[PDB]
Amino acid sequence: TYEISSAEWEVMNIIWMKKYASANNIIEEIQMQKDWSPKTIRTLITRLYKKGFIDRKKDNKIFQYYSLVEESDIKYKTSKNFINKVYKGGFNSLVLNFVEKEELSQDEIEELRNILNKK
Amino acid sequence: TYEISSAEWEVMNIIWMKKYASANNIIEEIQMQKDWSPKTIRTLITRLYKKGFIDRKKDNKIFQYYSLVEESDIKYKTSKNFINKVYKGGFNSLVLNFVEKEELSQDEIEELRNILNK
């Protein structure tokens, strides 16, 4: 529980990627998609720190940020909220809508099948 | 591209259901669940009118708002953006997460198996 913005998702996704990332890694990475200033981005990092979503160690002189949060857990709780809002008909509404509308590759399709078979 | 608030989703669904509807048809259908004021609810509609999500044919003296957006297109578009924001494995990755956490009875699982094959 407790919302995080689109921008915070971007920082977090990156920490869940390199596991440990310095402020500058994060700025370098992010600046590849979005045209944000370092100031802007440094702020986001601070808000997640102050917020307790992430913490930092200190390899060498440099500060490495890591997650104090359960990825699959927060994203999940986040999709639950997403569905409740948009798809009144539940999870299945979403999938039924995504399927008829997305031209899925045979591979993409198969990939979804054994995902359902694995318990 | 606009980001529809949750309250706006509420109103769209009503219009998508009815197809054509007056501020009043909408205000009544919504006060049934929400303690939102007529002013609040009218403001919402105006907000979607301005966003191009809807329009109004003035049948009689009473405006009748109806959608300017295909509901299956609009939501699909929404999901695709919600997924890019949160998931970096696309749809498949979202779906996987949902299954691993949600206790989906085979009864439930099977139901999905079907959507996928049909």
Side-chain angles (χ1 to χ4, degrees):
Chain A
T1 303
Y2 277 126
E3 293 67 78
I4 131 187
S5 66
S6 335
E8 285 161 331
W9 273 110
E10 210 140 347
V11 178
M12 289 304 295
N13 276 338
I14 299 191
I15 300 172
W16 290 316
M17 219 57 209
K18 354 283 192 179
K19 268 68 181 64
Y20 295 92
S22 60
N24 307 296
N25 285 170
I26 300 171
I27 298 183
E28 177 183 342
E29 265 293 289
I30 280 188
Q31 281 188 305
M32 295 195 97
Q33 242 84 298
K34 314 279 174 299
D35 302 328
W36 300 343
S37 57
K39 183 199 183 181
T40 287
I41 295 158
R42 276 172 192 301
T43 293
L44 301 185
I45 298 173
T46 287
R47 201 177 181 292
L48 293 160
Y49 179 61
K50 297 301 175 73
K51 239 55 195 176
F53 280 49
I54 66 178
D55 204 347
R56 21 113 105 129
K57 301 162 71 170
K58 191 156 194 162
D59 204 312
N60 270 61
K61 175 276 173 181
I62 304 69
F63 259 148
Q64 297 281 314
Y65 289 81
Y66 54 103
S67 181
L68 308 173
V69 180
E70 227 300 73
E71 180 172 25
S72 56
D73 257 10
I74 169 173
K75 298 216 196 188
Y76 172 65
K77 171 54 182 298
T78 280
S79 295
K80 252 302 183 166
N81 287 191
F82 176 54
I83 296 154
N84 310 165
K85 178 175 59 181
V86 187
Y87 291 105
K88 31 167 178 46
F91 178 55
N92 313 77
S93 267
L94 188 183
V95 197
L96 166 62
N97 174 266
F98 201 94
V99 167
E100 78 171 65
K101 238 68 192 173
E102 173 107 350
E103 181 169 293
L104 293 163
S105 70
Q106 195 58 50
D107 297 334
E108 297 197 307
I109 303 164
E110 294 309 348
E111 218 267 288
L112 282 180
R113 286 209 177 95
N114 26 303
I115 290 189
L116 255 137
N117 297 325
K118 296 279 286 188
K119 261 301 176 167
Chain B
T1 309
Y2 277 104
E3 236 291 84
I4 294 179
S5 87
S6 173
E8 305 174 273
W9 273 107
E10 207 67 291
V11 178
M12 285 294 92
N13 289 327
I14 289 175
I15 294 178
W16 278 319
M17 169 204 117
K18 286 183 180 190
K19 214 136 171 305
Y20 282 99
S22 177
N24 289 269
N25 314 54
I26 314 182
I27 287 193
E28 66 174 325
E29 284 267 49
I30 264 173
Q31 289 191 324
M32 290 215 288
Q33 314 288 172
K34 315 292 195 162
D35 171 52
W36 302 341
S37 78
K39 182 184 193 178
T40 284
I41 314 182
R42 272 188 297 266
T43 280
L44 283 177
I45 301 178
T46 299
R47 181 168 296 138
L48 284 154
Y49 174 63
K50 301 179 67 169
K51 287 177 156 200
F53 283 107
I54 62 176
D55 199 333
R56 28 141 127 149
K57 285 171 175 162
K58 192 168 190 184
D59 169 305
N60 192 291
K61 189 54 60 59
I62 52 183
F63 278 161
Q64 306 287 299
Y65 299 84
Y66 54 92
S67 199
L68 298 175
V69 294
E70 167 64 13
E71 168 184 29
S72 65
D73 270 287
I74 192 62
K75 286 185 186 183
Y76 170 52
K77 193 177 183 315
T78 292
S79 308
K80 284 232 69 62
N81 292 178
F82 174 83
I83 287 169
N84 293 164
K85 170 176 66 183
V86 179
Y87 295 103
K88 287 329 315 82
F91 182 50
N92 277 25
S93 175
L94 174 162
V95 175
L96 174 44
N97 174 275
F98 189 97
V99 164
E100 296 191 346
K101 275 77 233 306
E102 262 269 1
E103 179 281 320
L104 294 171
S105 297
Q106 183 54 50
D107 311 339
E108 297 183 284
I109 294 296
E110 199 48 36
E111 302 183 306
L112 291 179
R113 283 209 159 88
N114 180 288
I115 317 169
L116 207 174
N117 289 294
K118 304 298 152 294

Short mmCIF file of all heavy atoms in Angstrom, two decimals, chain A residues 40-91:
data_model
loop_
_atom_site.label_atom_id
_atom_site.label_comp_id
_atom_site.label_asym_id
_atom_site.label_seq_id
_atom_site.Cartn_x
_atom_site.Cartn_y
_atom_site.Cartn_z
N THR A 40 15.94 17.33 -11.30
CA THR A 40 14.65 16.66 -11.31
C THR A 40 14.71 15.25 -10.77
O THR A 40 13.97 14.87 -9.87
CB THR A 40 14.09 16.61 -12.74
OG1 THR A 40 13.66 17.92 -13.11
CG2 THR A 40 12.94 15.63 -12.86
N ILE A 41 15.62 14.49 -11.36
CA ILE A 41 15.85 13.10 -11.07
C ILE A 41 16.41 12.86 -9.68
O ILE A 41 16.02 11.90 -9.03
CB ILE A 41 16.77 12.55 -12.17
CG1 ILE A 41 15.99 12.60 -13.50
CG2 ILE A 41 17.30 11.18 -11.80
CD1 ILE A 41 16.87 12.61 -14.76
N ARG A 42 17.32 13.72 -9.22
CA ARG A 42 17.89 13.58 -7.88
C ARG A 42 16.79 13.70 -6.83
O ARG A 42 16.81 13.04 -5.78
CB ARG A 42 18.94 14.67 -7.65
CG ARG A 42 20.29 14.31 -8.20
CD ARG A 42 21.27 15.47 -8.13
NE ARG A 42 22.47 15.17 -8.92
CZ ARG A 42 23.27 14.13 -8.71
NH1 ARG A 42 23.03 13.27 -7.72
NH2 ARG A 42 24.32 13.94 -9.49
N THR A 43 15.82 14.56 -7.14
CA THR A 43 14.68 14.78 -6.27
C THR A 43 13.92 13.46 -6.11
O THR A 43 13.65 13.04 -5.00
CB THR A 43 13.70 15.84 -6.86
OG1 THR A 43 14.32 17.13 -6.88
CG2 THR A 43 12.42 15.92 -6.03
N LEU A 44 13.61 12.82 -7.22
CA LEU A 44 12.88 11.56 -7.18
C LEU A 44 13.58 10.55 -6.28
O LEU A 44 12.96 9.86 -5.46
CB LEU A 44 12.76 10.96 -8.57
CG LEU A 44 12.05 11.85 -9.58
CD1 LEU A 44 11.89 11.11 -10.91
CD2 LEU A 44 10.71 12.26 -9.03
N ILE A 45 14.88 10.48 -6.44
CA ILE A 45 15.63 9.55 -5.66
C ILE A 45 15.44 9.89 -4.21
O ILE A 45 15.10 9.01 -3.42
CB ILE A 45 17.12 9.57 -6.07
CG1 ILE A 45 17.24 9.16 -7.54
CG2 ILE A 45 17.90 8.60 -5.20
CD1 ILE A 45 18.63 9.29 -8.12
N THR A 46 15.61 11.15 -3.85
CA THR A 46 15.45 11.55 -2.46
C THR A 46 14.07 11.21 -1.89
O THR A 46 13.97 10.68 -0.78
CB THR A 46 15.72 13.03 -2.31
OG1 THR A 46 17.13 13.25 -2.43
CG2 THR A 46 15.24 13.54 -0.95
N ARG A 47 13.02 11.51 -2.63
CA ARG A 47 11.67 11.22 -2.17
C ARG A 47 11.44 9.72 -1.90
O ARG A 47 10.67 9.35 -1.01
CB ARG A 47 10.65 11.73 -3.20
CG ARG A 47 9.26 11.95 -2.64
CD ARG A 47 8.27 12.54 -3.66
NE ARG A 47 6.93 12.77 -3.09
CZ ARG A 47 6.06 11.82 -2.71
NH1 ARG A 47 6.37 10.54 -2.81
NH2 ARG A 47 4.88 12.16 -2.22
N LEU A 48 12.08 8.84 -2.66
CA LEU A 48 11.90 7.41 -2.43
C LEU A 48 12.72 6.98 -1.21
O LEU A 48 12.35 6.05 -0.50
CB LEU A 48 12.28 6.61 -3.67
CG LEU A 48 11.36 6.82 -4.90
CD1 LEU A 48 12.04 6.40 -6.20
CD2 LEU A 48 10.06 6.05 -4.73
N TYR A 49 13.83 7.69 -0.97
CA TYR A 49 14.72 7.42 0.16
C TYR A 49 13.99 7.85 1.43
O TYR A 49 13.74 7.02 2.32
CB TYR A 49 16.02 8.24 0.00
CG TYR A 49 17.06 8.09 1.11
CD1 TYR A 49 17.65 6.85 1.39
CD2 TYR A 49 17.50 9.21 1.84
CE1 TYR A 49 18.64 6.73 2.37
CE2 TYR A 49 18.51 9.10 2.82
CZ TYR A 49 19.07 7.85 3.09
OH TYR A 49 20.05 7.73 4.06
N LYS A 50 13.65 9.14 1.47
CA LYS A 50 12.92 9.73 2.58
C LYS A 50 11.65 8.94 2.87
O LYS A 50 11.21 8.85 4.01
CB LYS A 50 12.53 11.17 2.25
CG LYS A 50 13.71 12.10 2.03
CD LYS A 50 14.58 12.16 3.29
CE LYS A 50 15.87 12.97 3.12
NZ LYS A 50 15.64 14.45 3.07
N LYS A 51 11.07 8.37 1.80
CA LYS A 51 9.85 7.57 1.85
C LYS A 51 10.07 6.15 2.31
O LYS A 51 9.10 5.46 2.65
CB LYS A 51 9.19 7.52 0.46
CG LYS A 51 7.77 8.06 0.43
CD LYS A 51 7.72 9.50 0.99
CE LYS A 51 6.28 9.94 1.32
NZ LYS A 51 6.20 11.30 1.96
N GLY A 52 11.32 5.70 2.32
CA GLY A 52 11.62 4.35 2.76
C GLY A 52 11.40 3.25 1.72
O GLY A 52 11.22 2.08 2.07
N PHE A 53 11.42 3.61 0.44
CA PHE A 53 11.24 2.64 -0.63
C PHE A 53 12.58 2.06 -0.97
O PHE A 53 12.68 0.90 -1.35
CB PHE A 53 10.64 3.29 -1.88
CG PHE A 53 9.17 3.48 -1.79
CD1 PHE A 53 8.61 4.07 -0.67
CD2 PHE A 53 8.34 3.02 -2.78
CE1 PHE A 53 7.24 4.19 -0.54
CE2 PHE A 53 6.97 3.14 -2.65
CZ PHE A 53 6.42 3.73 -1.53
N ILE A 54 13.61 2.88 -0.82
CA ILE A 54 14.98 2.46 -1.09
C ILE A 54 15.93 2.99 -0.01
O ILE A 54 15.57 3.87 0.78
CB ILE A 54 15.45 3.01 -2.43
CG1 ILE A 54 15.52 4.54 -2.33
CG2 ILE A 54 14.54 2.49 -3.55
CD1 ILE A 54 16.01 5.22 -3.54
N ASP A 55 17.14 2.43 -0.01
CA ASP A 55 18.19 2.78 0.94
C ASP A 55 19.51 2.81 0.15
O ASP A 55 19.51 2.49 -1.05
CB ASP A 55 18.23 1.69 2.02
CG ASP A 55 18.81 2.17 3.35
OD1 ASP A 55 19.44 3.27 3.41
OD2 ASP A 55 18.63 1.40 4.33
N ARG A 56 20.62 3.17 0.80
CA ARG A 56 21.93 3.21 0.13
C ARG A 56 23.10 2.68 0.95
O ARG A 56 23.12 2.81 2.17
CB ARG A 56 22.26 4.64 -0.29
CG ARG A 56 21.47 5.67 0.48
CD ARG A 56 22.34 6.50 1.38
NE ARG A 56 22.53 7.84 0.83
CZ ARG A 56 22.34 8.96 1.51
NH1 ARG A 56 21.94 8.93 2.79
NH2 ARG A 56 22.55 10.12 0.91
N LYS A 57 24.07 2.06 0.27
CA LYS A 57 25.30 1.55 0.89
C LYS A 57 26.31 2.62 0.48
O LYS A 57 25.91 3.76 0.25
CB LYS A 57 25.72 0.20 0.29
CG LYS A 57 24.68 -0.87 0.42
CD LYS A 57 24.93 -2.00 -0.55
CE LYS A 57 26.15 -2.81 -0.17
NZ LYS A 57 26.23 -4.05 -1.00
N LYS A 58 27.58 2.28 0.38
CA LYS A 58 28.53 3.30 -0.04
C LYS A 58 29.80 2.76 -0.65
O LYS A 58 30.89 3.16 -0.24
CB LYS A 58 28.85 4.24 1.13
CG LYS A 58 29.60 5.47 0.68
CD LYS A 58 29.44 6.63 1.64
CE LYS A 58 29.90 7.94 0.99
NZ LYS A 58 29.38 9.16 1.69
N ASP A 59 29.68 1.87 -1.63
CA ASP A 59 30.86 1.30 -2.28
C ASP A 59 31.81 2.43 -2.75
O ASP A 59 31.45 3.26 -3.59
CB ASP A 59 30.44 0.43 -3.47
CG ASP A 59 31.49 -0.62 -3.82
OD1 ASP A 59 32.69 -0.27 -3.93
OD2 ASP A 59 31.11 -1.80 -4.00
N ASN A 60 33.02 2.43 -2.19
CA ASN A 60 34.02 3.47 -2.47
C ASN A 60 33.49 4.80 -1.93
O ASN A 60 32.86 4.84 -0.87
CB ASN A 60 34.32 3.57 -3.96
CG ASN A 60 35.47 2.66 -4.39
OD1 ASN A 60 35.40 1.43 -4.26
ND2 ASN A 60 36.54 3.27 -4.90
N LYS A 61 33.74 5.88 -2.65
CA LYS A 61 33.25 7.19 -2.21
C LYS A 61 31.77 7.28 -2.57
O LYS A 61 30.98 7.90 -1.85
CB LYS A 61 34.06 8.30 -2.90
CG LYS A 61 33.60 9.72 -2.63
CD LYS A 61 32.46 10.11 -3.56
CE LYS A 61 31.88 11.46 -3.17
NZ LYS A 61 30.74 11.85 -4.06
N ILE A 62 31.42 6.62 -3.67
CA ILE A 62 30.09 6.58 -4.26
C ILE A 62 28.97 5.85 -3.51
O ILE A 62 29.16 4.78 -2.96
CB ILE A 62 30.16 5.99 -5.70
CG1 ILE A 62 31.16 6.78 -6.56
CG2 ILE A 62 28.81 6.06 -6.36
CD1 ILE A 62 32.63 6.63 -6.17
N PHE A 63 27.78 6.46 -3.54
CA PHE A 63 26.58 5.94 -2.90
C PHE A 63 25.74 5.07 -3.81
O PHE A 63 25.21 5.54 -4.81
CB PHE A 63 25.70 7.10 -2.45
CG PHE A 63 25.81 7.40 -1.01
CD1 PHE A 63 25.66 8.69 -0.54
CD2 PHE A 63 26.07 6.38 -0.10
CE1 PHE A 63 25.78 8.98 0.81
CE2 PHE A 63 26.19 6.65 1.26
CZ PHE A 63 26.04 7.96 1.71
N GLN A 64 25.59 3.81 -3.44
CA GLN A 64 24.78 2.88 -4.23
C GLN A 64 23.39 2.66 -3.61
O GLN A 64 23.29 2.20 -2.46
CB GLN A 64 25.50 1.54 -4.38
CG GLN A 64 26.84 1.60 -5.12
CD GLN A 64 26.70 1.66 -6.63
OE1 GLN A 64 25.93 0.92 -7.24
NE2 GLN A 64 27.47 2.54 -7.25
N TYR A 65 22.34 2.97 -4.38
CA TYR A 65 20.96 2.82 -3.95
C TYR A 65 20.43 1.43 -4.23
O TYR A 65 20.77 0.84 -5.26
CB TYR A 65 20.07 3.84 -4.67
CG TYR A 65 20.30 5.24 -4.21
CD1 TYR A 65 21.36 6.01 -4.69
CD2 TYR A 65 19.52 5.78 -3.18
CE1 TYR A 65 21.65 7.27 -4.14
CE2 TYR A 65 19.80 7.04 -2.62
CZ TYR A 65 20.86 7.77 -3.10
OH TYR A 65 21.13 8.99 -2.53
N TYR A 66 19.64 0.89 -3.31
CA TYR A 66 19.02 -0.44 -3.50
C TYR A 66 17.57 -0.42 -3.00
O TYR A 66 17.13 0.52 -2.33
CB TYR A 66 19.83 -1.58 -2.82
CG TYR A 66 20.12 -1.38 -1.35
CD1 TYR A 66 19.40 -2.08 -0.38
CD2 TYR A 66 21.04 -0.43 -0.92
CE1 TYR A 66 19.57 -1.82 0.98
CE2 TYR A 66 21.22 -0.16 0.43
CZ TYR A 66 20.48 -0.85 1.37
OH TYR A 66 20.63 -0.54 2.71
N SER A 67 16.82 -1.45 -3.33
CA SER A 67 15.41 -1.47 -2.95
C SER A 67 15.13 -2.13 -1.62
O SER A 67 15.68 -3.19 -1.30
CB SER A 67 14.57 -2.17 -4.05
OG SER A 67 13.17 -2.21 -3.75
N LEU A 68 14.26 -1.50 -0.84
CA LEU A 68 13.83 -2.06 0.43
C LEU A 68 12.42 -2.57 0.18
O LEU A 68 11.68 -2.88 1.13
CB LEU A 68 13.79 -0.98 1.53
CG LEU A 68 15.03 -0.10 1.74
CD1 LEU A 68 14.68 0.97 2.74
CD2 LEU A 68 16.23 -0.92 2.20
N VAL A 69 12.06 -2.69 -1.10
CA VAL A 69 10.72 -3.12 -1.48
C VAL A 69 10.58 -4.34 -2.36
O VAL A 69 11.39 -4.62 -3.26
CB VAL A 69 9.94 -1.94 -2.13
CG1 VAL A 69 8.55 -2.39 -2.52
CG2 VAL A 69 9.84 -0.78 -1.15
N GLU A 70 9.49 -5.05 -2.08
CA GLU A 70 9.14 -6.26 -2.79
C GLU A 70 8.55 -5.91 -4.17
O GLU A 70 7.40 -5.50 -4.29
CB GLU A 70 8.13 -7.04 -1.94
CG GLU A 70 8.43 -8.51 -1.79
CD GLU A 70 8.46 -9.24 -3.13
OE1 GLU A 70 9.43 -9.05 -3.90
OE2 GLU A 70 7.50 -10.00 -3.40
N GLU A 71 9.36 -6.09 -5.21
CA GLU A 71 8.96 -5.80 -6.59
C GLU A 71 7.67 -6.44 -7.03
O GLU A 71 6.67 -5.77 -7.30
CB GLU A 71 10.05 -6.24 -7.55
CG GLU A 71 9.72 -5.97 -9.00
CD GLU A 71 10.89 -6.23 -9.94
OE1 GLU A 71 11.77 -7.04 -9.57
OE2 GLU A 71 10.92 -5.64 -11.04
N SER A 72 7.69 -7.76 -7.12
CA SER A 72 6.50 -8.48 -7.53
C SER A 72 5.32 -8.15 -6.61
O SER A 72 4.16 -8.26 -7.01
CB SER A 72 6.77 -9.99 -7.55
OG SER A 72 7.24 -10.45 -6.30
N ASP A 73 5.60 -7.74 -5.39
CA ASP A 73 4.50 -7.45 -4.50
C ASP A 73 3.82 -6.10 -4.76
O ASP A 73 2.58 -6.04 -4.88
CB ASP A 73 4.94 -7.55 -3.03
CG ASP A 73 4.47 -8.84 -2.36
OD1 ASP A 73 3.97 -9.74 -3.07
OD2 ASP A 73 4.60 -8.96 -1.13
N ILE A 74 4.61 -5.04 -4.84
CA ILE A 74 4.06 -3.71 -5.07
C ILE A 74 3.38 -3.56 -6.43
O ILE A 74 2.30 -2.94 -6.52
CB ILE A 74 5.15 -2.62 -4.92
CG1 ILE A 74 4.61 -1.27 -5.42
CG2 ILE A 74 6.39 -3.00 -5.71
CD1 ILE A 74 5.52 -0.11 -5.15
N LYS A 75 4.01 -4.14 -7.46
CA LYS A 75 3.50 -4.11 -8.83
C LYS A 75 2.16 -4.79 -8.87
O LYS A 75 1.24 -4.35 -9.57
CB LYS A 75 4.44 -4.83 -9.76
CG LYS A 75 5.78 -4.20 -9.84
CD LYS A 75 6.27 -4.34 -11.25
CE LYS A 75 7.76 -4.09 -11.35
NZ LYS A 75 8.17 -4.06 -12.79
N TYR A 76 2.07 -5.88 -8.11
CA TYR A 76 0.85 -6.65 -8.01
C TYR A 76 -0.24 -5.78 -7.38
O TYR A 76 -1.34 -5.58 -7.93
CB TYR A 76 1.09 -7.90 -7.15
CG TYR A 76 -0.19 -8.66 -6.84
CD1 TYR A 76 -0.93 -9.27 -7.85
CD2 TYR A 76 -0.71 -8.67 -5.54
CE1 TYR A 76 -2.17 -9.87 -7.58
CE2 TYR A 76 -1.96 -9.27 -5.26
CZ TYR A 76 -2.67 -9.86 -6.29
OH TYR A 76 -3.90 -10.42 -6.01
N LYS A 77 0.05 -5.28 -6.19
CA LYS A 77 -0.93 -4.47 -5.52
C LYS A 77 -1.28 -3.31 -6.45
O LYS A 77 -2.42 -2.86 -6.46
CB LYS A 77 -0.39 -3.97 -4.17
CG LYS A 77 -1.24 -2.91 -3.43
CD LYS A 77 -2.71 -3.31 -3.21
CE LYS A 77 -3.51 -2.20 -2.51
NZ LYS A 77 -2.99 -1.86 -1.15
N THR A 78 -0.32 -2.87 -7.27
CA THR A 78 -0.58 -1.75 -8.18
C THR A 78 -1.52 -2.09 -9.33
O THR A 78 -2.29 -1.23 -9.75
CB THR A 78 0.76 -1.11 -8.72
OG1 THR A 78 1.32 -0.24 -7.73
CG2 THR A 78 0.51 -0.30 -9.96
N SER A 79 -1.47 -3.33 -9.82
CA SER A 79 -2.33 -3.82 -10.92
C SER A 79 -3.71 -4.09 -10.38
O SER A 79 -4.71 -3.99 -11.10
CB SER A 79 -1.81 -5.14 -11.52
OG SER A 79 -0.56 -5.00 -12.16
N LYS A 80 -3.77 -4.48 -9.12
CA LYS A 80 -5.06 -4.74 -8.53
C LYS A 80 -5.83 -3.44 -8.57
O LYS A 80 -6.98 -3.41 -9.01
CB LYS A 80 -4.91 -5.23 -7.09
CG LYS A 80 -5.23 -6.70 -6.93
CD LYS A 80 -6.66 -6.99 -7.38
CE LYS A 80 -7.03 -8.47 -7.16
NZ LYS A 80 -8.49 -8.74 -7.28
N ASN A 81 -5.18 -2.36 -8.16
CA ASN A 81 -5.80 -1.04 -8.15
C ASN A 81 -6.09 -0.59 -9.54
O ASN A 81 -7.14 0.00 -9.79
CB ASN A 81 -4.90 -0.04 -7.48
CG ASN A 81 -4.86 -0.21 -5.99
OD1 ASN A 81 -4.35 0.64 -5.29
ND2 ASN A 81 -5.42 -1.33 -5.49
N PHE A 82 -5.17 -0.86 -10.46
CA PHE A 82 -5.40 -0.48 -11.84
C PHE A 82 -6.69 -1.11 -12.35
O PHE A 82 -7.55 -0.41 -12.86
CB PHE A 82 -4.25 -0.89 -12.75
CG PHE A 82 -4.51 -0.57 -14.20
CD1 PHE A 82 -4.86 0.72 -14.61
CD2 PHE A 82 -4.43 -1.57 -15.17
CE1 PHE A 82 -5.12 1.02 -15.95
CE2 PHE A 82 -4.70 -1.27 -16.51
CZ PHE A 82 -5.04 0.02 -16.90
N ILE A 83 -6.81 -2.43 -12.24
CA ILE A 83 -8.01 -3.14 -12.70
C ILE A 83 -9.28 -2.60 -12.06
O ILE A 83 -10.22 -2.29 -12.76
CB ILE A 83 -7.96 -4.64 -12.39
CG1 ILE A 83 -6.81 -5.29 -13.16
CG2 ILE A 83 -9.27 -5.28 -12.77
CD1 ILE A 83 -6.26 -6.56 -12.50
N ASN A 84 -9.30 -2.51 -10.73
CA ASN A 84 -10.47 -2.00 -10.00
C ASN A 84 -11.00 -0.70 -10.62
O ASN A 84 -12.21 -0.49 -10.69
CB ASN A 84 -10.13 -1.72 -8.53
CG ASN A 84 -9.43 -2.89 -7.84
OD1 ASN A 84 -8.85 -2.73 -6.76
ND2 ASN A 84 -9.48 -4.07 -8.46
N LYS A 85 -10.08 0.16 -11.06
CA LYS A 85 -10.43 1.43 -11.69
C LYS A 85 -11.00 1.29 -13.10
O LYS A 85 -12.16 1.58 -13.36
CB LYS A 85 -9.20 2.34 -11.72
CG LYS A 85 -9.40 3.71 -12.39
CD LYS A 85 -8.16 4.61 -12.26
CE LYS A 85 -6.92 3.98 -12.89
NZ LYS A 85 -5.69 4.81 -12.76
N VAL A 86 -10.16 0.82 -14.01
CA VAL A 86 -10.51 0.66 -15.42
C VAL A 86 -11.42 -0.51 -15.85
O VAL A 86 -12.50 -0.31 -16.42
CB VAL A 86 -9.23 0.61 -16.23
CG1 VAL A 86 -9.54 0.62 -17.75
CG2 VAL A 86 -8.34 1.78 -15.81
N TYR A 87 -10.97 -1.73 -15.59
CA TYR A 87 -11.77 -2.89 -15.98
C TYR A 87 -12.73 -3.34 -14.89
O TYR A 87 -12.39 -4.16 -14.05
CB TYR A 87 -10.84 -4.03 -16.36
CG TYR A 87 -10.11 -3.77 -17.64
CD1 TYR A 87 -8.76 -3.42 -17.64
CD2 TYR A 87 -10.78 -3.80 -18.86
CE1 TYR A 87 -8.08 -3.11 -18.83
CE2 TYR A 87 -10.12 -3.50 -20.06
CZ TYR A 87 -8.77 -3.15 -20.03
OH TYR A 87 -8.12 -2.86 -21.21
N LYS A 88 -13.95 -2.80 -14.91
CA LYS A 88 -14.93 -3.20 -13.90
C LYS A 88 -15.16 -4.72 -13.88
O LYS A 88 -15.44 -5.29 -12.82
CB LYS A 88 -16.27 -2.45 -14.13
CG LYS A 88 -16.57 -2.11 -15.58
CD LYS A 88 -18.01 -1.67 -15.75
CE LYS A 88 -18.29 -1.28 -17.22
NZ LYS A 88 -17.77 -2.26 -18.25
N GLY A 89 -15.01 -5.38 -15.04
CA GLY A 89 -15.17 -6.83 -15.14
C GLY A 89 -14.01 -7.71 -14.67
O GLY A 89 -13.94 -8.91 -14.98
N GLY A 90 -13.08 -7.11 -13.93
CA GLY A 90 -11.94 -7.84 -13.40
C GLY A 90 -10.82 -8.19 -14.35
O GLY A 90 -10.84 -7.86 -15.55
N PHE A 91 -9.82 -8.86 -13.79
CA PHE A 91 -8.64 -9.30 -14.52
C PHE A 91 -8.90 -9.84 -15.91
O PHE A 91 -8.16 -9.55 -16.85
CB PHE A 91 -7.91 -10.36 -13.70
CG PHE A 91 -6.69 -10.91 -14.39
CD1 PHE A 91 -5.67 -10.04 -14.82
CD2 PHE A 91 -6.50 -12.28 -14.53
CE1 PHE A 91 -4.49 -10.54 -15.39
CE2 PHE A 91 -5.33 -12.78 -15.10
CZ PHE A 91 -4.31 -11.90 -15.52
#
